[PDB]
Amino acid sequence: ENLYFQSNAMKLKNPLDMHLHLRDNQMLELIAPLSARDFCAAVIMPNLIPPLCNLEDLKAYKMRILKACKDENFTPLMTLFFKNYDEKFLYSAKDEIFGIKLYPAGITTNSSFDIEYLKPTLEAMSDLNIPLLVHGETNDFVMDRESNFAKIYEKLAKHFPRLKIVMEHITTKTLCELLKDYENLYATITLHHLIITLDDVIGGKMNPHLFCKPIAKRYEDKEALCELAFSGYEKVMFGSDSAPHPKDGCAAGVFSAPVILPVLAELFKQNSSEENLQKFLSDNTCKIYDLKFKEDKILTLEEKEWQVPNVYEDKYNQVVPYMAGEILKFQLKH
Amino acid sequence: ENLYFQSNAMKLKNPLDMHLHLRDNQMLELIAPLSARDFCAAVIMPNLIPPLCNLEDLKAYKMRILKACKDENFTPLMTLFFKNYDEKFLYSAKDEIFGIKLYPAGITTNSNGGVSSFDIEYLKPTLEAMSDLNIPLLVHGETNDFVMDRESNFAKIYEKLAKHFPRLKIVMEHITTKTLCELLKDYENLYATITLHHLIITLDDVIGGKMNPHLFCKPIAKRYEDKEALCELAFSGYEKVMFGSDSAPHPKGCAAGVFSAPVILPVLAELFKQNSSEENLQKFLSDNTCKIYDLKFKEDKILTLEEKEWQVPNVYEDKYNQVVPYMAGEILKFQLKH
Numbered sequence: 104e105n106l107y108f109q110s111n112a113m114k115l116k117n118p119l120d121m122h123l124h125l126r127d128n129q130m131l132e133l134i135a136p137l138s139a140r141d142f143c144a145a146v147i148m149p150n151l152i153p154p155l156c157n158l159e160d161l162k163a164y165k166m167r168i169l170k171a172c173k174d175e176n177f178t179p180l181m182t183l184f185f186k187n188y189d190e191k192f193l194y195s196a197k198d199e200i201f202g203i204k205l206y207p208a209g210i211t212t213n214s215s216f217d218i219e220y221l222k223p224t225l226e227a228m229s230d231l232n233i234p235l236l237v238h239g240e241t242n243d244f245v246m247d248r249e250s251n252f253a254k255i256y257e258k259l260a261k262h263f264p265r266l267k268i269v270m271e272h273i274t275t276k277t278l279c280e281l282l283k284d285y286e287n288l289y290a291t292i293t294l295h296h297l298i299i300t301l302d303d304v305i306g307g308k309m310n311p312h313l314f315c316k317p318i319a320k321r322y323e324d325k326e327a328l329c330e331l332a333f334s335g336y337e338k339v340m341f342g343s344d345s346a347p348h349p350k351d352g353c354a355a356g357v358f359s360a361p362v363i364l365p366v367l368a369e370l371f372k373q374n375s376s377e378e379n380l381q382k383f384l385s386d387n388t389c390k391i392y393d394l395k396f397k398e399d400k401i402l403t404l405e406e407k408e409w410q411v412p413n414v415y416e417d418k419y420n421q422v423v424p425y426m427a428g429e430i431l432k433f434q435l436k437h
Numbered sequence: 438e439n440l441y442f443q444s445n446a447m448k449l450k451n452p453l454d455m456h457l458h459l460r461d462n463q464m465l466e467l468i469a470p471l472s473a474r475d476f477c478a479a480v481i482m483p484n485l486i487p488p489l490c491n492l493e494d495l496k497a498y499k500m501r502i503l504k505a506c507k508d509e510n511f512t513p514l515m516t517l518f519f520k521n522y523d524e525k526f527l528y529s530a531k532d533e534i535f536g537i538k539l540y541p542a543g544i545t546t547n548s549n550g551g552v553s554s555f556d557i558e559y560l561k562p563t564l565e566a567m568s569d570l571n572i573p574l575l576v577h578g579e580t581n582d583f584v585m586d587r588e589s590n591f592a593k594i595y596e597k598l599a600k601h602f603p604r605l606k607i608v609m610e611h612i613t614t615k616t617l618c619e620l621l622k623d624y625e626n627l628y629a630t631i632t633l634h635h636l637i638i639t640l641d642d643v644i645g646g647k648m649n650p651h652l653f654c655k656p657i658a659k660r661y662e663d664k665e666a667l668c669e670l671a672f673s674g675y676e677k678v679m680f681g682s683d684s685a686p687h688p689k690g691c692a693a694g695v696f697s698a699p700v701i702l703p704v705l706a707e708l709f710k711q712n713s714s715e716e717n718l719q720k721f722l723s724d725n726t727c728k729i730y731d732l733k734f735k736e737d738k739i740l741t742l743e744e745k746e747w748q749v750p751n752v753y754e755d756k757y758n759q760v761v762p763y764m765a766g767e768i769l770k771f772q773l774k775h
């Protein structure tokens with residue numbers, strides 16, 4: 104529609120963040136609202152110290168999140184850290200969790216990954232319709248860690264053709280292509296991997312604020328990621344992997360939470376459509392897991408410049424955000 | 438060799454650092470001694486602001502270097518920053534300079550006035566005079582392509598320069614790829630320098646775990662097979678390879694460069710014992726360069742290294758600057774008689 108209003112440049116419905124890190128305690132209080140105010144729900148990753156491996160610690164964490172957000176409507180979609188859980192246990196938790204997140208540890212390729220430890224649990228998960236979320240990286244050379252995990256994703260897809268396997272934060276053309284080879288393979292894509300490549304991280308001066316895992320790769324990889332997100336391909340969902348770290352330059356992670364919607368807005372207007380953004384941020388997820396909502400959350404973006412602050416700050420913590428100091432074209436009223 | 442005395446009495450004769458950055462002014466006064474003490478000579482890169490492009494300024498900088506070294510036996514091998522010099526200018530400079538260093542436009546630290554074209558006719562007059570006058574072309578071999586491919590993609594350029602200027606000595610500085618290790622064997626006029634760090638680290642050390650800015654330099658450390666090929670050339674003492682540290686300090690993230698000057702000899706000493714011979718170390722650090730250029734010395738500078746542990750300072754301070762050294766805070770198995 105050619106003519107439009109400054110106050111309504113984009114409208115988004117029930118935006119979901121399918122990969123979020125909210126940390127805990129004092130940090131959680133600082134950053135949860137930043138996601139809560141722009142999303143109706145987010146998959147909360149379980150990599151706390153120590154990791155969430157039982158339902159009592161999960162509920163307590165859920166409660167801390169609900170307190171810190173203070174922006175209902177916001178439903179945290181809870182997850183457990185992967186370990187060898189038995190059928191009885193999973194049956195017990197299915198109504199309490201959205202999924203189980205696997206963090207592989209110690210994988211060499213010539214690989215040394217034995218899925219036998221996983222089989223009983225994955226078989227149960229399949230039958231109970233519980234999705235497996237995976238941080239798909241081996242321990243090989245940093246640029247190859249994701250691509251070398253492709254064969255591990257294939258193996259899992261064949262051995263468990265009824266299990267939903269979400270390849271988290273894909274960053275390679277390899278996985279962009281693998282995604283289309285198996286029906287039960289899905290993926291989440293971050294905001295940053297649609298914009299950066301390795302050159303941004305170490306091509307000129309080293310830029311720690313753009314450092315994350317998996318590392319940003321090549322231009323061909325970035326284009327493959329953009330083609331899936333911009334086309335709204337049914338099996339890709341937005342997952343920020345917003346992962347803050349207290350300001351000291353060496354820890355991995357990008358805190359993109361507060362700038363996600365505005366940056367995606369601009370990105371899709373320039374390269375795609377409101378409808379495809381709507382799919383990438385919500386409809387795709389809703390179609391895959393059959394989600395529905397009682398009270399819709401509608402976010403309206405206004406075409407009014409603002410400068411991203413150099414930090415989001417609390418008494419106990421200071422976090423540098425993605426795009427810190429940059430000027431964005433769109434903004435939500437908070 | 439199964440038996441030895443007091444400590445590993447390893448002698449090194451006339452070590453040469455064929456690729457070194459000494460900066461200027463106050464910085465020079467602080468770091469120059471750290472090299473002048475362990476080396477008898479070093480190729481001094483001209484990437485100053487502004488870059489050394491005339492004899493007057495080169496002499497001036499040389500004088501500054503000589504003062505900064507003081508009582509040390511050390512000959513700085515001077516270079517000019519590459520540009521389209523003519524035969525007349527080159528003829529007057531041949532005895533004042535060791536070589537001319539080519540930096541591709543805006544690829545590394547202080548290169549904005551660099552070469553932006555490798556057109557054969559554009560460079561012909563200069564490279565032919567250099568060829569006739571036996572002046573060598575030292576090159577920072579990287580394109581502006583994707584960071585991990587900058588050096589390998591530069592191979593076609595070194596190759597055309599070699600074919601078009603077959604009597605020119607072309608030194609591929611700080612090589613970091615198997616591609617250039619191999620290309621070195623294809624043309625008689627191709628030579629190379631290798632750094633200390635590139636014999637040791639890969640990209641994984643720089644960004645595999647935590648980002649380690651102290652290990653960040655240009656050309657970026659690459660793959661395991663790249664490092665192995667570099668080690669095979671250095672350890673075997675291959676005649677066309679010479680040690681060049683590319684020691685480059687930065688005042689205290691982060692800027693590109695490793696400041697390895699203070700720790701080169703002992704670190705190299707340990708490396709060559711585990712993987713090579715004292716003879717091959719002597720070749721890599723000195724004899725190869727000496728043979729390639731026909732160097733001679735009024736009096737030799739013999740340095741002895743003993744296995745007496747020592748911790749590397751976390752910084753090399755003074756009144757004007759403070760620099761973090763390579764291997765900072767590390768415990769080295771070898772030492773030089775200070």
Ligand SMILES: [Zn+2]
Nearest residue numbers: 238271272316
């Ligand atoms: Zn992850």
Ligand SMILES: [Zn+2]
Nearest residue numbers: 122124148344
């Ligand atoms: Zn994550």
Ligand SMILES: [Zn+2]
Nearest residue numbers: 545577610611
């Ligand atoms: Zn260089």
Ligand SMILES: [Zn+2]
Nearest residue numbers: 456458482683
């Ligand atoms: Zn250099």
